[PDB]
UniProtKB/Swiss-Prot annotation, chain A:
Belongs to the influenza viruses PB2 family. Influenza RNA polymerase is composed of three subunits: PB1, PB2 and PA. Interacts (via N-terminus) with PB1 (via C-terminus). Interacts with nucleoprotein NP (via N-terminus). Interacts (via N-terminus) with host MAVS (via N-terminus); this interaction inhibits host innate immune response. South Carolina isolate has been sequenced from formalid fixed-lung tissues of a 21-year-old male which died in 1918 at Ft. Jackson, SC. Brevig Mission isolate has been sequenced from lung tissues of an Inuit woman buried in the permafrost in a gravesite near Brevig Mission, Alaska. This sample was recovered by John Hultin, retired pathologist. It comes from the Viruses. This is Polymerase basic protein 2. Plays an essential role in transcription initiation and cap-stealing mechanism, in which cellular capped pre-mRNAs are used to generate primers for viral transcription. Recognizes and binds the 7-methylguanosine-containing cap of the target pre-RNA which is subsequently cleaved after 10-13 nucleotides by the viral protein PA. Plays a role in the initiation of the viral genome replication and modulates the activity of the ribonucleoprotein (RNP) complex. It is found in: Virion; Host nucleus; Host mitochondrion.
Swiss-Prot record, chain B:
It comes from the Viruses. This is RNA-directed RNA polymerase catalytic subunit. The gene is PB1. Belongs to the influenza viruses polymerase PB1 family. It is found in: Host nucleus; Host cytoplasm. Influenza RNA polymerase is composed of three subunits: PB1, PB2 and PA. Interacts (via N-terminus) with PA (via C-terminus). Interacts (via C-terminus) with PB2 (via N-terminus); this interaction is essential for transcription initiation. Interacts (via C-terminus) with human PKP2 (via N-terminus); the interaction competitively inhibits the interaction between the RNA polymerase subunits PB1 and PB2. It comes from Influenza A virus (strain A/Brevig Mission/1/1918 H1N1) (Influenza A virus (strain A/South Carolina/1/1918 H1N1)). South Carolina isolate has been sequenced from formalid fixed-lung tissues of a 21-year-old male which died in 1918 at Ft. Jackson, SC. Brevig Mission isolate has been sequenced from lung tissues of an Inuit woman buried in the permafrost in a gravesite near Brevig Mission, Alaska. This sample was recovered by John Hultin, retired pathologist. Phosphorylated by host PRKCA.
Curated annotation (Swiss-Prot), chain E:
Mn(2+) 1 binds at H41, D108, E119, I120. A motif (Nuclear localization signal 1 (NLS1)) lies at residues 124-139. It comes from the Viruses. Belongs to the influenza viruses PA family. Plays an essential role in viral RNA transcription and replication by forming the heterotrimeric polymerase complex together with PB1 and PB2 subunits. The complex transcribes viral mRNAs by using a unique mechanism called cap-snatching. It consists in the hijacking and cleavage of host capped pre-mRNAs. These short capped RNAs are then used as primers for viral mRNAs. The PB2 subunit is responsible for the binding of the 5' cap of cellular pre-mRNAs which are subsequently cleaved after 10-13 nucleotides by the PA subunit that carries the endonuclease activity. Disulfide bonds: none annotated. This is Polymerase acidic protein. It is found in: Host cytoplasm; Host nucleus. Mn(2+) 2 binds at E80, D108. The chain holds residues 1 to 205 of 716 of the full protein. South Carolina isolate has been sequenced from formalid fixed-lung tissues of a 21-year-old male which died in 1918 at Ft. Jackson, SC. Brevig Mission isolate has been sequenced from lung tissues of an Inuit woman buried in the permafrost in a gravesite near Brevig Mission, Alaska. This sample was recovered by John Hultin, retired pathologist. Influenza RNA polymerase is composed of three subunits: PB1, PB2 and PA. Interacts (via C-terminus) with PB1 (via N-terminus).
């Protein structure tokens, strides 16, 4: 929509870069990745949490016969599941889907109204409300 | 990888376990399980010597 | 500001003193393992170069 | 040379071997030629 | 003590004992009773496992020495004396094959008839305190427990004993032989003193 030329108060803030993070840390999610792809090399780590257990059953089905590389399938599940944070000058925004386009939505003198395509979760919407 | 076991020892033991589990429930029938166990014994003997 | 000859004036003996102060009331093995590096730097030698 | 504690795959054992190499009366290295 | 423990036990057991004790970075010289404890544990597990093979059914058939034939199948896969990574990979393979339960602590062997793990133990103190220690340590357990004593009396859960009585008599003979050669050496009490120390090892840099 319309571009609004206005002073941008870009406040440096830690903001989540990844937009599909299942709220699991890198070490926390490496064990789910192993249980999905490498079920015999997991070690003593027992996946107590129910969220990890649902993620395992659902993800196992999709990758039944993938023939790219199990290392690439593991890096895939790393990208989808591993959380990531980065200090970034942010004004407005602060969402997962609005920070991946922060080079397009925010400038030094201009604001760009934008609405990503994905169906938005209503928790974020009510927080903003 | 982590451990303390030597290359050949880990490889032969892992293969032995795989043959055992495949024989109990898997593709491997007695012939291939026996061949694998014999070859692994040969590898262990050659390692010790 | 900036510091002139920063590295030249940073004695490893005062890094050993700082490490000994930081590691007070701690297992002696930890104190020794953290002290070893300043000990090696205090006695360090430098190769002159290519020639 | 006989300092094989570093085969434990722990950094502190490699440092114990490095420290125990200095209390040895003779190191043994190898040099290439042609 | 090192001379005796190097002489009596065969080289495979003492080898595995330095292997296991070194795995954690423990020094054989500053901690010497531990090496003998590990050697005894390894030997008793190997003896509990050896001289046992499986038939088409269960109810292990015993032999003096294994016969050369297709019956290569072994009754017990000895998890003890294995690297931690491979130990947990064999455990995971078993759990994924038989759908069994995953223990919280490393078991020592696995049996297919009753289809579950076994955790052998050897203790200086008599049975009914180390047994309850192991039991309240291994909480929510299915792994059978079978602890021995140097005197000659053992115990287990459900009063269950997973093998013949002659093999138990052999184990007991070996342990009594060790005990009454220790009595001659005077080492026995030295071993006795450090049981509490056994629980944990302190770093020494």
């Amino acid at each position: 929509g319309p571009v609004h030329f206005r002073n941008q108060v870009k406040i440096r803030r830690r903001v989540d870069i990844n937009p599909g993070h299942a709220d699991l840390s890198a070490k926390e999610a490496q064990d789910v990745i192993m249980e999905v792809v490498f079920p015999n090399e997991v070690g003593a780590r027992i996946l107590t949490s129910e969220s990890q257990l649902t993620i395992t059953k659902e993800k196992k089905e999709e990758l039944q016969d993938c023939k790219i590389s199990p290392l690439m399938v593991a890096y895939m599940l790393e990208r989808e599941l591993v959380r990531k944070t980065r200090f970034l000058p942010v004004a407005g925004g602060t969402s997962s889907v609005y920070i991946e386009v922060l080079h397009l939505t925010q400038g030094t003198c201009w604001e760009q109204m934008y609405t990503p395509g994905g169906e938005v979760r209503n928790d974020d919407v009510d927080q903003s409300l | 990888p982590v451990g303390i076991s030597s290359m050949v020892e880990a490889m032969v033991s892992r293969a032995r376990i795989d043959a055992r589990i495949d024989f109990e429930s898997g593709r491997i029938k007695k012939e291939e399980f026996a061949e694998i166990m014999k070859i692994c014994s040969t590898i262990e003997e050659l390692r010790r010597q | 500001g900036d510091n002139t000859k920063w590295n030249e004036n940073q004695n490893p003996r005062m890094f050993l003193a700082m490490i000994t102060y930081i590691t007070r009331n701690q297992p002696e093995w930890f104190r020794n393992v953290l002290s070893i590096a300043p000990i090696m730097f205090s006695n360090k030698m430098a190769r002159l170069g290519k020639g | 040379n006989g300092l094989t504690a570093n085969e434990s795959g722990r950094l502190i054992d490699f440092l114990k071997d490095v420290m125990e190499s200095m209390d040895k009366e003779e190191m043994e290295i190898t040099t290439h030629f042609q | 003590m090192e001379d005796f423990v190097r002489q009596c036990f065969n080289p495979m057991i003492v080898e595995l004992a330095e292997k296991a004790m070194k795995e954690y970075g423990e020094d054989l010289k500053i901690e010497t009773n531990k090496f003998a404890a590990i050697c005894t544990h390894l030997e008793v597990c190997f003896m509990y496992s050896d001289f046992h093979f499986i038939n088409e059914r269960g109810e292990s058939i015993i032999v003096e020495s294994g016969d050369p034939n297709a019956l290569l199948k072994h009754r017990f896969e000895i998890i003890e004396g294995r690297d931690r990574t491979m130990a947990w990979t064999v455990v995971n393979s078993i759990c994924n094959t038989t759908g069994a339960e995953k223990p919280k602590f490393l078991p020592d062997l696995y049996d297919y008839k009753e289809n579950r793990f076994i955790e052998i133990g050897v203790t200086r103190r008599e049975v009914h305190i180390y047994y309850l220690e192991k039991a309240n340590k291994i909480k929510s357990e299915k792994t059978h427990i079978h602890i021995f004593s140097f005197t000659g009396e053992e115990m287990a859960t459900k009063a269950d004993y997973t093998l013949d009585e002659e093999s138990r008599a052999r184990i007991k003979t070996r342990l009594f032989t060790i005990r009454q050669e220790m009595a001659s050496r005077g080492l026995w009490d030295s071993f006795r003193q450090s049981e509490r120390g056994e629980e944990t090892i302190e770093e020494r840099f």
